[PDB]
């Protein structure tokens, strides 16, 4: 079963089934990430910021040294003040990228950006928050669509680095969002694949037990069999225990002919969820000079 892995993470070697799942324990600057939820009001629901913090956290190591020239060439973009009191440093989100329970970054997203989101049962998604941290595009929350490619003021909560990705340079644009919507094993088996291969990081969605029905993922690897349908997907989960880490998830047709992850192998007796759609974040790597 041929697999593939986001670029820069080195597939963990610690796997070990629990016992629930099949499971690799969180190891530090192995390229993946997995912001763990402390449900303290806040970020109960927030698993759309989680998601968007492990890949911005992704994104940090790719970028490494371009975010430090940036720092050098805009010293103001590194904090982010709110009248007098400072909001945020992205530096201290640099150097806590690693930890699970207190990064900066999600500390950041559920303590100032999105706080009231999850007393209020509704919340935010992945490509949203990050064109919002990167480029400063303004989040709404009534908008339920792709991110539009327009131009104008900068969200107070982020473009950080809006001086070189900018709002309305389409080609400045480092997300992108995928609709599942009734497409089968095949397309969706290729989309991944793709991506992956194109060297991007990405987010999945998929139905819970809750009100909306409705969850976010990261997606590091997958797994495909040999006529190239999806077999499994290795993901952190931000509403997982923080002991558990990268989670193995099984990837099959379910009895109501949907496409379906769960923990354990997809049965009669085991529907699993269905994947809804995809979010994915490129590095940008080739858009930083501005002398171009």
């Known amino acids: 079963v041929t697999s593939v892995w986001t670029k820069g993470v080195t597939p963990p070697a610690n796997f070990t089934q629990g016992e629930d799942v099949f499971h690799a324990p969180y190891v530090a600057n192995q ?14 629901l927030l698993c759309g910021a989680a998601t968007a913090g492990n890949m911005l956290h992704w994104w940090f190591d790719q970028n490494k040294d371009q975010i430090k020239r940036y720092l050098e060439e805009h010293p103001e973009k590194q904090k982010i003040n709110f009248n007098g009191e400072q909001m945020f440093d992205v530096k ?31 919340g935010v998604f992945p490509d949203h928050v990050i064109d919002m941290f990167i480029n400063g595009y303004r989040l709404s929350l009534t908008n339920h669509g792709p991110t539009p490619v327009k131009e104008g003021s900068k969200d107070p909560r982020g473009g950080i680095f809006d001086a070189v990705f900018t709002r309305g340079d389409q080609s400045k644009l480092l997300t992108s969002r995928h609709d599942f919507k ?12 793709k991506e992956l291969t194109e060297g991007k990081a990405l987010g999945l969605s998929h139905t819970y037990a809750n009100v909306r029905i409705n969850h976010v ?19 952190t989960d931000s509403d997982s225990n923080a002991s558990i880490g990268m989670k193995k998830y099984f ?27 995809l979010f994915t974040l490129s590095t940008g790597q080739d858009s930083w000079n501005q002398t171009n």
């Open 92 to 122: 201290e989100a640099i150097d806590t990228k690693n930890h699970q329970l207190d990064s900066k970054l999600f500390e950041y997203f559920k303590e100032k950006a999105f706080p009231y989101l999850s007393t209020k049962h509704l």
């Open 217 to 235: 993922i990261n997606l590091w690897g997958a797994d495909f069999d040999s006529n190239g349908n999806l077999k499994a997907i290795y993901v």
């Open 31 to 44: 390229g993946w990430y997995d912001i763990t939820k402390t449900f303290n009001g806040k970020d109960d």
């Open 251 to 277: 990837v099959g047709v379910n009895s109501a002919g949907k496409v379906a992850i769960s923990a354990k192998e997809i049965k009669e007796d085991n529907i699993g969820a269905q994947v809804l759609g």
């Open 182 to 193: 009734e497409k089968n094993l095949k397309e969706i088996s290729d989309l991944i694949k």
